[PDB]
Design an enzyme around this catalytic site. Structure first.
Site, PDB file in Angstrom:
ATOM      1  N   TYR A   1     -19.450  17.206  28.872  1.00  0.00           N
ATOM      2  CA  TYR A   1     -18.849  15.875  28.675  1.00  0.00           C
ATOM      3  C   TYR A   1     -17.374  15.787  29.048  1.00  0.00           C
ATOM      4  CZ  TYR A   1     -23.132  15.162  26.057  1.00  0.00           C
ATOM      5  OH  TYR A   1     -24.470  15.102  25.675  1.00  0.00           O
TER       6      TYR A   1
HETATM    7  C1  F43 Z   1     -27.448  20.494  27.658  1.00  0.00           C
HETATM    8  C2  F43 Z   1     -27.114  20.102  26.296  1.00  0.00           C
HETATM    9  C3  F43 Z   1     -25.652  20.582  26.139  1.00  0.00           C
HETATM   10  C4  F43 Z   1     -24.881  19.383  26.543  1.00  0.00           C
HETATM   11  O1  F43 Z   1     -23.630  19.425  26.460  1.00  0.00           O
HETATM   12  N1  F43 Z   1     -25.563  18.328  26.079  1.00  0.00           N
HETATM   13  C5  F43 Z   1     -27.057  18.518  25.936  1.00  0.00           C
HETATM   14  C6  F43 Z   1     -27.922  17.631  26.844  1.00  0.00           C
HETATM   15  C7  F43 Z   1     -27.493  16.124  26.700  1.00  0.00           C
HETATM   16  C8  F43 Z   1     -28.286  15.170  27.584  1.00  0.00           C
HETATM   17  C9  F43 Z   1     -29.848  15.521  27.668  1.00  0.00           C
HETATM   18  C10 F43 Z   1     -30.593  14.771  28.807  1.00  0.00           C
HETATM   19  C11 F43 Z   1     -31.516  15.684  29.540  1.00  0.00           C
HETATM   20  O2  F43 Z   1     -32.475  16.175  28.821  1.00  0.00           O
HETATM   21  O3  F43 Z   1     -31.571  15.694  30.818  1.00  0.00           O
HETATM   22  C12 F43 Z   1     -27.897  13.809  26.908  1.00  0.00           C
HETATM   23  C13 F43 Z   1     -29.071  12.756  27.023  1.00  0.00           C
HETATM   24  C14 F43 Z   1     -26.649  13.233  27.506  1.00  0.00           C
HETATM   25  C15 F43 Z   1     -26.789  12.781  28.992  1.00  0.00           C
HETATM   26  N2  F43 Z   1     -26.381  13.439  29.989  1.00  0.00           N
HETATM   27  O4  F43 Z   1     -27.429  11.705  29.287  1.00  0.00           O
HETATM   28  C16 F43 Z   1     -27.740  14.393  25.407  1.00  0.00           C
HETATM   29  N3  F43 Z   1     -27.484  15.577  25.418  1.00  0.00           N
HETATM   30 NI1  F43 Z   1     -28.046  16.565  23.496  1.00  0.00          NI
HETATM   31  N4  F43 Z   1     -28.915  14.886  22.672  1.00  0.00           N
HETATM   32  C17 F43 Z   1     -29.370  14.692  21.460  1.00  0.00           C
HETATM   33  C18 F43 Z   1     -29.551  15.708  20.453  1.00  0.00           C
HETATM   34  C19 F43 Z   1     -29.122  17.004  20.521  1.00  0.00           C
HETATM   35  C20 F43 Z   1     -29.533  18.145  19.664  1.00  0.00           C
HETATM   36  C21 F43 Z   1     -31.058  18.304  19.832  1.00  0.00           C
HETATM   37  C22 F43 Z   1     -31.629  19.214  18.653  1.00  0.00           C
HETATM   38  C23 F43 Z   1     -33.162  19.143  18.568  1.00  0.00           C
HETATM   39  O5  F43 Z   1     -33.689  20.011  17.795  1.00  0.00           O
HETATM   40  O6  F43 Z   1     -33.862  18.687  19.499  1.00  0.00           O
HETATM   41  C24 F43 Z   1     -28.747  19.316  20.244  1.00  0.00           C
HETATM   42  C25 F43 Z   1     -27.559  19.558  19.321  1.00  0.00           C
HETATM   43  C26 F43 Z   1     -27.971  20.054  17.958  1.00  0.00           C
HETATM   44  O7  F43 Z   1     -28.640  21.152  17.957  1.00  0.00           O
HETATM   45  O8  F43 Z   1     -27.493  19.583  16.907  1.00  0.00           O
HETATM   46  C27 F43 Z   1     -28.471  18.932  21.656  1.00  0.00           C
HETATM   47  C28 F43 Z   1     -28.136  19.724  22.663  1.00  0.00           C
HETATM   48  C29 F43 Z   1     -27.765  19.500  24.032  1.00  0.00           C
HETATM   49  N5  F43 Z   1     -27.426  18.367  24.497  1.00  0.00           N
HETATM   50  C30 F43 Z   1     -27.953  20.654  25.006  1.00  0.00           C
HETATM   51  C31 F43 Z   1     -29.454  20.818  25.490  1.00  0.00           C
HETATM   52  C32 F43 Z   1     -30.277  21.297  24.215  1.00  0.00           C
HETATM   53  C33 F43 Z   1     -31.497  22.002  24.704  1.00  0.00           C
HETATM   54  O9  F43 Z   1     -31.314  22.844  25.629  1.00  0.00           O
HETATM   55  O10 F43 Z   1     -32.613  21.481  24.517  1.00  0.00           O
HETATM   56  N6  F43 Z   1     -28.661  17.484  21.733  1.00  0.00           N
HETATM   57  C34 F43 Z   1     -29.868  15.128  19.088  1.00  0.00           C
HETATM   58  O11 F43 Z   1     -29.746  15.669  17.982  1.00  0.00           O
HETATM   59  C35 F43 Z   1     -30.629  13.745  18.987  1.00  0.00           C
HETATM   60  C36 F43 Z   1     -30.142  12.756  20.022  1.00  0.00           C
HETATM   61  C37 F43 Z   1     -30.086  13.316  21.381  1.00  0.00           C
HETATM   62  C38 F43 Z   1     -29.426  12.533  22.564  1.00  0.00           C
HETATM   63  C39 F43 Z   1     -30.239  11.437  23.112  1.00  0.00           C
HETATM   64  C40 F43 Z   1     -30.376  10.217  22.253  1.00  0.00           C
HETATM   65  O12 F43 Z   1     -29.502   9.931  21.395  1.00  0.00           O
HETATM   66  O13 F43 Z   1     -31.384   9.462  22.388  1.00  0.00           O
HETATM   67  C41 F43 Z   1     -29.084  13.670  23.479  1.00  0.00           C
HETATM   68  C42 F43 Z   1     -27.775  13.392  24.295  1.00  0.00           C
HETATM   69  C1  LIG Z   2     -12.499  14.535  26.220  1.00  0.00           C
HETATM   70  C2  LIG Z   2     -12.177  13.550  27.355  1.00  0.00           C
HETATM   71  O1  LIG Z   2     -12.530  14.113  28.620  1.00  0.00           O
HETATM   72  P1  LIG Z   2     -11.549  14.900  29.583  1.00  0.00           P
HETATM   73  O2  LIG Z   2     -11.263  16.264  28.834  1.00  0.00           O
HETATM   74  O3  LIG Z   2     -12.364  15.067  30.938  1.00  0.00           O
HETATM   75  O4  LIG Z   2     -10.247  14.016  29.616  1.00  0.00           O
HETATM   76  C3  LIG Z   2     -12.846  12.185  27.177  1.00  0.00           C
HETATM   77  N1  LIG Z   2     -14.288  12.253  27.008  1.00  0.00           N
HETATM   78  C4  LIG Z   2     -14.887  12.155  25.835  1.00  0.00           C
HETATM   79  O5  LIG Z   2     -14.204  12.011  24.700  1.00  0.00           O
HETATM   80  C5  LIG Z   2     -16.393  11.928  25.811  1.00  0.00           C
HETATM   81  C6  LIG Z   2     -16.916  11.226  24.606  1.00  0.00           C
HETATM   82  C7  LIG Z   2     -18.363  10.752  24.532  1.00  0.00           C
HETATM   83  C8  LIG Z   2     -19.393  11.814  25.010  1.00  0.00           C
HETATM   84  C9  LIG Z   2     -19.571  12.831  23.833  1.00  0.00           C
HETATM   85  C10 LIG Z   2     -20.209  12.298  22.546  1.00  0.00           C
HETATM   86  S1  LIG Z   2     -20.565  13.393  21.281  1.00  0.00           S
HETATM   87  S2  LIG Z   2     -22.667  13.174  21.330  1.00  0.00           S
HETATM   88  C11 LIG Z   2     -23.378  14.371  22.457  1.00  0.00           C
HETATM   89  C12 LIG Z   2     -23.572  15.682  21.702  1.00  0.00           C
HETATM   90  S3  LIG Z   2     -24.905  16.657  22.426  1.00  0.00           S
HETATM   91  O6  LIG Z   2     -26.174  15.798  22.461  1.00  0.00           O
HETATM   92  O7  LIG Z   2     -24.478  16.963  23.874  1.00  0.00           O
HETATM   93  O8  LIG Z   2     -25.020  17.948  21.604  1.00  0.00           O
HETATM   94  C13 LIG Z   2     -12.573  11.298  28.362  1.00  0.00           C
HETATM   95  O9  LIG Z   2     -11.408  10.655  28.331  1.00  0.00           O
HETATM   96  O10 LIG Z   2     -13.374  11.146  29.389  1.00  0.00           O
END
Ligand code: F43
Ligand SMILES: C[C@@H](OP(=O)(O)O)[C@H](NC(=O)/C=C/CCCCSSCCS(=O)(=O)O)C(=O)O
Ligand code: F43
Ligand SMILES: [Cl-]
Ligand SMILES: [Mg+2]
Ligand SMILES: [Mg+2]
Ligand SMILES: [Mg+2]
Ligand SMILES: [Mg+2]
Ligand code: NA
Ligand code: NA
Ligand code: NA
Ligand code: NA
Ligand code: NA
Ligand code: NA
Ligand code: NA
Ligand SMILES: [Zn+2]
EC number: 2.8.4.1
Lengths: 247, 548, 442, 548, 55
Positions: C366
């Site tokens: 991110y």
């Molecule tokens: C690659 C990452 C690391 C990264 O920085 N962000 C990811 C992936 C990203 C992608 C996943 C899309 C994809 O599948 O192609 C998106 C949708 C953001 C995006 N680019 O659009 C997302 N996370 Ni994540 N992500 C979430 C979640 C979480 C939970 C999932 C835990 C569970 O047991 O399944 C964990 C964090 C945790 O352990 O607390 C997590 C991890 C991760 N999150 C691990 C991938 C985990 C794994 O390999 O399966 N998400 C959530 O806890 C629920 C909501 C959910 C988001 C989508 C939505 O809100 O509908 C999504 C939000």
């Molecule tokens: C931190 C800073 O980015 P930079 O270091 O590139 O300036 C800043 N970006 C952010 O604060 C991004 C905030 C929203 C995305 C992250 C939400 S926390 S929810 C995802 C958690 S997981 O599903 O991946 O586990 C920006 O100004 O674009």
């Protein structure tokens, strides 16, 4: 050191996982080559890749901190930094995400640990990672039904179990054998197929999972009934609160 | 009798909600889903028409090894797949943000003083009505002074207009009622009395610019567009020279001296102008939501309608697109407005407080925080432990953390009648939860929560602020999902229990009590359900100017 | 004479330099060496004469991949660098005997410039450094080669970039450790917006000097922000002393005791024992086989804990020779110490919270990046009031080559120029000596 | 024979263009116009539907006491009323801005080095193709790693995709051609050679995010959205841990170290984030326009297609809505792209230069500026004097000042081959015009033109810059119509005369040479005409998720 | 009328110490004068310096 307050089995288990003088119970035997296969970073018999030259070939700044701090072996060699990642079921897995990071930084040198609800990770120099990973896989850190080795697609900590008592895995890396009552690893942690599967032994039975677990639950030992552990958490809240207003 | 979430759990799964085991892997992957099947076919058509591959279910890992669940929109009987609640696929959600982004509140108090003292002309209810007829021609993009002007198509800009309000009932009665937001009609008696006393004899405009313009441009367009057409209408209706020295006073008044933006501008790392989501403070978001004037005997319902408003806007559109993008954060937000789960936990806490203290009757101190937030946190986490289907539904730790702490923090504020002790209760919930399950949220979820306790009552420069004044740009809050919408709920909580007409700004409260808005802010969860079902008609579309 | 506290001050080899120094002799408000470093950082600029020359010859000005075909100018700038820099100095100086400094480096490819203090004495802020330097070099280059009125605007574009169309000096061939005033996250933040890689580059990867420079800059910002006024002043001064200046040799001795085989957890145990031994903490209550500790001096407990935190970083990231885990150390040092003791962690939870988000934004899709691109003004790491970033500087100083965005990649021009300045390169020595010098004035 | 504007003047008026008198007041006011009639009818319907008065021809003064003219879109045979060229009423214009706002250029050069050096893995043409198949599924908003993800509807986001380009022909040949912008196909041989030499072996992505999202959100969304889905596709295609320390290097590379925004952020008074109109420099706007690669034997056509591009975006959308609003600034911009008038003046200038000096063969100095700019200024002003119909058409002095000076400045740069002397010619034109007719533009028109001469060659901090690097946030240029789009044309002029492949950034030039864009940048004035006729089909509509 | 001491600006990058030091000193002095509680003191901060840091 005292590590954690509380008078439950859970609280004692949390203390034991942190204490480097507590000998973790070994539950299964895994070959050196099979640890390398499960990690998936290199093939057995392939040289460790490097990210920089060996420390002895470089000219470091004169620095008393560098002199006093001994580098781990993989740092001396210039190894890549690589990882191992586990997911732990909320249905009584032995280790849990904050227990792991807290214990890793008490037991292991040169560690980058990360805690999330569905995944917990350690990153360190590759040859040292391989040694740590043997302990994480062979001991009561791991159960092959209620824990999983997963570098992606981690979903499952919070899901219901299947009919064998195994945790969900989107990529089905760990397969329960009805004929032996044992679990085999059939894929590495990123999900690619292994030439030969790895025996991970029998899942712990229900009574042993209860004895060894570090999660609190109403159908186990509830956190609200560990009143000394609750008291310290409430204390920390109050003292943090007062300190941000005045000293 | 039953927990409020039981029906939704029974709809989702074949098993009873208390069962610990299920069956996976035999559901057909994506083929179990009506919605995923629609997407697969649409991806084939898109790639074929354009000559570049696009949506393809076999890229990466195979969705639907577990049940792809329906979600109940809370307080409704509507069940939809989660994809129908993504802001891209939901026109209600997009229109909710357009209606906030395209709104500005603009005084007429300095303007009328300019007319009287500098131009030497009279202002009466009749001159104000003539001015309002004029500005309702001009505001959508049409001319009043020059020859050979070319103009917006009135049907493309049908959602743009100007209304007024004032606390003086007798003056309000003399302005033509097509242009007046009637406080005594829209608000219950005691709330109307409070609001009119706040406004007094002041007179304020609520200006809405066209959705088609807001979408083409940005939020910082709104107060400028408003001021240009106010300026032209002041010239036309009061007979100024068309451009003399006094004309600049109307410009400065409408752009600066008597303007109320929905949002303030943001710092350079996340650079944005005014009227973007990150500048909207939590107290304004609670006042934009109009649940308070319709559901005033139920302070839980008022508070959780605010949570829904804020979780959607702040997590799906703001954090999930403006600050990131892609698949985004639909279910991080849906956890707070689906399955009646937050509702069950918050009604428990309200009942607990009412029976022990009486609403608003608890001492405003840490003893109350420790009591109420601990009790409610333990209630909520016990439900996930007692019902495995509930834990599989809210599968991400971050979702559970936000839901449980929202109930704890709202309940604590129901007891004390003060938002700041509510917020202290939110942070304590996180700390208890983390120790109970040895997990909390995603990797970066509790940045603000570990700073949290100490920063609740701090008075330092970039630390100290009443919760009602905080927002998405408060330093600790600027990055992460599962907090901002819930904080708007905690801001609403004490005021709902007290029976207050507003949380932070009475002008903002009145400005959204307007039946000419497109989105219905009195029933935010009902509207989300209507857009999910593809039954919401937004403004801004270009059908009239494109091929049939 | 406002506070009774005294500290013992040491060098970067662990030797006692000056005993019994009044705490306020290290305050940014009183210590002349801190004043000199701050005024120095405001007035110092690096000029890349080779880069200006190459940009002109290729017409590549105004940002990444930008070029104007037909505008190329071939000027022998590096070959005439002595004459150009002397001409520039004449415009930059106020009088012939002032503190203006202009020094060629790298055979004329680079220049170190320090704009005179008199210009800052009648300035609101610090932008006179880059703006006075840039126009003196633009004018000197034009005058050296008689560049025409028609072509001179290309020299301006080569020196200062796309400014004023861009807000920043986009594509510029000059650099400073500070960044423009518009990029501050709030008023009072300018001394926080200094990249960790720039601090590590200026101190040549010496760990304790890097920790010292970062702490002086962070805690000095805390005075400018008003955070160190009134009730909180003593806490911030004790933080500077014990975490950034190795007061009482506490950081040094914890690293010595835990460097060969230690972990984060072993450093924690040593620090708790030391706090007990010195009377900073004591047992308040006994639970079941668990001692709850209390303190009558929260600011001193915080300082001791902060010294432990720095040592724990040095031990953990030092053993890996890899900086990435500093985010983990910042988190679990504080998490562990709270459950070890019953007392609040460093900055009352704010270091832990900063570490949670810094971990995420150095291991996710991110934003953020590696440890070396952060700073006290970054949205991810601004939350702790001076007690987090100095550990990140120590960790990057200890990194042996694991980073793509290393000081070598981001900070090469800063390294060549700013490491020449003795007070920037070795600040610990100068701040200690000054504190000794003013000791009886407190 | 005829001047190029004669056909258009003959279609507008019953009189021959040379006649000095006409008839007014008896045309029936607004009733003479098909379009005004449409608007009056729409206003009545709108007002009735919503219960608030709206468009009404009897408010203010009565339009249409003179002829309400049709306009010819220059280089076409399309004639329309001016309301059809208003950006609100013209979907082609709105889609031109969306196509720029939603685009970012993102290298793969640092990303590929992270893979090889930090991860120790290989990058080949095959792994790149696999990566591009992955990102073309993910970029529109669909999932590649996690279970139970909810996704955007593929047909709502059909316009989002990722392509690459590179100067290495052999590598380009190995990547699936669906994903490649082919430089040898899209550019004539000599231009292709230049562009490939600039890019070398670098590999660059052109990323377009969905129009629906860009409209919901803002320009600063684009590089964030792009970076999130690049990050997921790197994890999936190259088998990272899904979130390890190295994942942060891909984020910093895609968001900061190897990103090319279309626009830079703006200062607080006009606060905006990246990719908004005020941050796009004139040199980039010229390179976005693709007239250069198709009309390369006609430097006038290339330059004036750039003028049309910039006059619309910078005066109608940017200055006329983001920075103001209302009726706005349609005809201030249409003067530069209608009736073949700027074309006639600029073809005269090019012929003068060709005959006297030879294109690009005049000395680059003030002598050439004084010669060419004066001669072309007098030509243009003499047309308004000889043809009273032309003067009544371009009725506002600002319009005439921009058109005459744009011819003068472009023709000066045709002679010198340098934009800065072209700019000097523009300002000299304004000074001569002002003295000849004892008027110039609107009250504030020449703020920049009186600072102008002195700031052309200045080298001071906020004064000195080559014209290609200037843009709408250059201090003198930040407020006023009738300059910014003409400056983009002057930036293009010397490069077009020289036969240069680009003006300021070769990556930007290649990035819009893409037949999968919605708007056709090779024929900007053609597209404006199609939009005026209600024949253009935009992206971004919500019709699939709303009721029939 | 408040003039913040020159020595604070001698070690500052710019000029925001004036408002920030003055505001916190008056916030703390008011709290101390009336013994304003921890629960209510954030209202004193809002009355002196406004909506900062949200704005
Ligand atoms: C690659 C990452 C690391 C990264 O920085 N962000 C990811 C992936 C990203 C992608 C996943 C899309 C994809 O599948 O192609 C998106 C949708 C953001 C995006 N680019 O659009 C997302 N996370 Ni994540 N992500 C979430 C979640 C979480 C939970 C999932 C835990 C569970 O047991 O399944 C964990 C964090 C945790 O352990 O607390 C997590 C991890 C991760 N999150 C691990 C991938 C985990 C794994 O390999 O399966 N998400 C959530 O806890 C629920 C909501 C959910 C988001 C989508 C939505 O809100 O509908 C999504 C939000
Ligand atoms: C931190 C800073 O980015 P930079 O270091 O590139 O300036 C800043 N970006 C952010 O604060 C991004 C905030 C929203 C995305 C992250 C939400 S926390 S929810 C995802 C958690 S997981 O599903 O991946 O586990 C920006 O100004 O674009
Ligand atoms: C009220 C002002 C002062 C003010 O600050 N702006 C005005 C009005 C504003 C309004 C007029 C809309 C309406 O009629 O209700 C708009 C459309 C901006 C907006 N709010 O939408 C505009 N001007 Ni004006 N304005 C214009 C122009 C001009 C020319 C018109 C000269 C004449 O002989 O007709 C003169 C300036 C000058 O003398 O050079 C002018 C003045 C003025 N301009 C005088 C009113 C003049 C009058 O009383 O008739 N504009 C023009 O020169 C052409 C383009 C035209 C703009 C609309 C378009 O671009 O399509 C319009 C642009
Ligand atoms: Cl103290
Ligand atoms: Mg063995
Ligand atoms: Mg030479
Ligand atoms: Mg005739
Ligand atoms: Mg004639
Ligand atoms: Na069921
Ligand atoms: Na898939
Ligand atoms: Na940014
Ligand atoms: Na005719
Ligand atoms: Na009219
Ligand atoms: Na402004
Ligand atoms: Na529809
Ligand atoms: Zn928009």
């Amino acid at each position: 050191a005292q590590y954690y307050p509380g008078t439950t089995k859970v609280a004692q288990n949390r203390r034991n996982f942190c204490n480097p003088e507590y000998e973790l119970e070994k539950l299964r035997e895994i070959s050196d080559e099979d640890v390398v296969k499960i990690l998936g970073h290199r093939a057995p018999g392939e040289e460790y890749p490097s990210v920089h030259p060996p420390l002895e070939e470089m000219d470091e700044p004169e620095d008393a901190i560098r002199e006093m701090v001994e580098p781990i072996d993989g740092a001396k060699a210039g190894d890549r930094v690589r990882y191992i990642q586990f997911t732990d079921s909320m249905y009584f897995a032995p280790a849990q995400p904050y227990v792991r990071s807290r214990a890793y930084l008490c037991r292991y040198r040169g560690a980058d640990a990360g805690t999330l609800s569905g995944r917990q990770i350690i990153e360190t120099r590759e040859r040292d990672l391989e040694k740590i990973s043997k302990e994480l896989l062979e001991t009561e850190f791991f159960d092959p039904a209620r824990s999983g080795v997963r570098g992606k697609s981690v979903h499952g900590h919070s899901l219901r179990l299947d009919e064998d008592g195994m945790m969900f895995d989107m990529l089905r890396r760990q397969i329960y054998n009805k004929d032996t009552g044992r679990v085999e690893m059939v894929k590495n942690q990123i999900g690619d197929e292994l030439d030969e599967p790895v025996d991970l032994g029998e899942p712990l039975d229900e009574e042993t999972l209860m004895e060894k677990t570090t999660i609190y639950r109403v159908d186990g030992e509830a956190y609200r009934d560990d009143v000394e552990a609750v008291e310290i958490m409430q204390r920390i809240h109050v003292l943090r609160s007062q300190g941000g207003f005045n000293l | 009798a039953d927990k409020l979430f039981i029906n939704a759990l029974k709809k989702k799964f074949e098993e009873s909600p208390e069962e610990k085991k299920t069956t996976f892997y035999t559901l057909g992957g994506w083929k179990q889903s009506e919605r995923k099947t629609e997407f697969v076919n649409a991806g084939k058509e898109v790639a074929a028409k354009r000559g570049i591959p696009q949506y393809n279910p076999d890229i990466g890992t195979p969705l639907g090894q577990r049940v792809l669940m329906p979600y109940q929109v809370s307080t409704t009987d509507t069940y939809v797949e989660g994809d129908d609640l993504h802001f891209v696929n939901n026109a209600a959600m997009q229109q909710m943000w357009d209606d906030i982004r395209r709104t500005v509140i603009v005084g007429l108090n300095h303007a009328h003083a300019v007319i009287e003292k500098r131009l030497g002309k009279e202002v009466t209810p009749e001159t104000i009505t003539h001015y309002l007829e004029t500005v309702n021609h001009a505001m959508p993009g049409a001319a009043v002074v020059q020859e050979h002007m070319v103009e917006t198509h009135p049907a493309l800009v049908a959602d743009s207009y100007v209304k007024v309000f004032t606390g003086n009932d007798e003056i309000a009665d003399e302005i033509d009622p097509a242009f007046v937001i009637d406080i005594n009609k829209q608000f219950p008696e005691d709330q109307a009395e409070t609001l009119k006393a706040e406004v007094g004899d002041g007179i304020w405009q609520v200006v809405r610019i066209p959705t088609i313009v807001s979408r083409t441009c940005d939020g910082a367009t709104t107060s400028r567009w408003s001021a240009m057409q106010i300026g032209m209408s002041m010239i036309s209706a009061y007979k100024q020279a068309a451009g003399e020295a006094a004309t600049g006073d109307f410009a400065y008044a409408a752009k600066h001296a008597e303007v109320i933006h929905m949002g303030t501008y943001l710092p350079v790392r996340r650079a944005r102008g005014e009227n973007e989501p990150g500048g909207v403070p939590f107290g304004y978001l609670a006042d934009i939501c109009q649940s308070s004037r319709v559901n005033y005997e139920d302070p839980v319902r008022v508070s959780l309608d605010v949570v829904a408003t804020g979780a959607m806007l702040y997590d799906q559109i703001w954090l999930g697109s403006y600050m990131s993008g892609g698949v985004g954060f639909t279910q991080y937000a849906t956890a707070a407005y689906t399955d009646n789960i937050l509702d069950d936990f918050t009604y428990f806490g309200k009942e607990y407080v009412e029976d022990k203290y009486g609403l608003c009757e608890a001492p405003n101190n840490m003893d109350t925080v420790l009591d109420v937030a601990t009790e409610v946190t333990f209630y909520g986490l016990e439900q996930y432990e007692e019902y495995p289907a509930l834990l599989e539904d809210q599968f991400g730790g971050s979702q559970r953390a936000a839901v449980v702490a929202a109930a704890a923090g709202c309940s604590t504020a129901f007891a004390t009648g003060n938002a700041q002790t509510g917020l202290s209760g939110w942070y304590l919930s996180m700390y208890l939860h983390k120790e109970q399950h040895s997990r909390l949220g995603f990797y970066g979820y509790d940045l603000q929560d570990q700073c949290g306790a100490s920063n609740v009552f701090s008075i330092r420069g970039d630390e100290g602020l009443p919760l009602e004044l905080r927002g998405p740009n408060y330093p600790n809050y600027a990055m992460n999902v599962g907090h901002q919408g819930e904080y708007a709920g905690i801001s609403q909580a004490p005021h709902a229990a007290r029976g207050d007409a507003f949380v932070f700004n009475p002008l903002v409260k009145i400005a959204f009590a307007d039946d000419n808005l497109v989105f219905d802010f009195t029933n935010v969860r009902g509207e989300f359900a209507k857009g999910a079902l593809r039954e919401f008609e937004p403004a801004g579309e270009r059908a009239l100017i494109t091929p049939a | 004479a406002k506070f009774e506290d005294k500290v013992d001050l040491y060098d970067d080899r662990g030797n006692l330099v000056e005993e019994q120094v009044p705490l306020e002799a290290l305050s940014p408000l009183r210590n002349p060496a801190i004043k000199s470093i701050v005024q120095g950082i405001k007035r110092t600029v690096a000029v890349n004469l080779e880069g200006i020359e190459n940009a002109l010859k290729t017409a590549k000005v105004g940002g990444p991949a930008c070029k104007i075909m037909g505008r190329e100018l071939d000027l022998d700038i590096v070959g005439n660098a002595e004459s150009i820099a002397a001409a520039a100095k004449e415009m930059i100086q106020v009088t012939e005997d002032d503190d203006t400094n202009v020094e060629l480096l790298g055979g004329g490819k680079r220049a170190l410039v320090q704009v005179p203090s008199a210009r800052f004495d009648v300035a609101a802020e610090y932008s006179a450094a880059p703006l006075v330097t840039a126009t003196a070099f633009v004018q000197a280059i034009i005058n050296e080669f008689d560049v025409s009125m028609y072509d001179a605007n290309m020299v301006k574009a080569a020196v200062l970039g796309r400014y004023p169309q861009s807000v920043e000096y986009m594509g510029a061939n000059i650099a400073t450790m500070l960044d423009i005033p518009q990029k501050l996250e709030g008023p009072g933040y300018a001394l926080r917006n200094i990249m960790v890689n720039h601090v590590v580059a200026a101190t040549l990867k010496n760990t304790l000097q890097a920790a010292a420079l970062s702490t002086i800059l962070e805690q000095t910002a805390m005075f400018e922000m008003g955070d160190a006024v009134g009730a909180f002043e003593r806490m911030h001064l004790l933080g500077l002393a014990y975490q950034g200046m190795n007061a009482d040799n506490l950081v040094f001795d914890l690293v010595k005791a835990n460097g060969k085989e230690g972990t984060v957890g072993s450093v924690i145990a040593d620090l708790v024992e030391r706090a007990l031994e010195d009377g900073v903490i004591k047992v308040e209550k006994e639970l079941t086989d668990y001692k709850v500790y209390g303190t009558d001096d929260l600011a001193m407990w915080n300082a001791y804990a902060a010294a432990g935190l720095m040592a724990a970083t040095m031990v953990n990231q030092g053993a890996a020779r890899a900086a990435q885990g500093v985010s983990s150390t910042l988190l679990y040092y504080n998490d562990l110490i709270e459950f070890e003791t019953g007392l609040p962690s460093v900055d009352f939870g704010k270091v832990e919270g900063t570490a949670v988000g810094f971990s995420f934004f150095s291991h996710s899709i991110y934003g953020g990046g590696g440890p070396g691109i952060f700073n006290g003004n970054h949205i991810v790491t601004r939350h702790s009031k001076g007690f987090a970033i100095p550990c990140v500087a120590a960790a990057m100083a200890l990194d042996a080559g694991t980073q793509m965005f290393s000081p070598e990649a981001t900070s090469g021009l800063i390294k060549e120029v700013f490491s020449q300045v003795d007070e920037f390169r070795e600040p610990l020595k100068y701040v200690v000596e000054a504190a000794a010098e003013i000791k009886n004035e407190i």
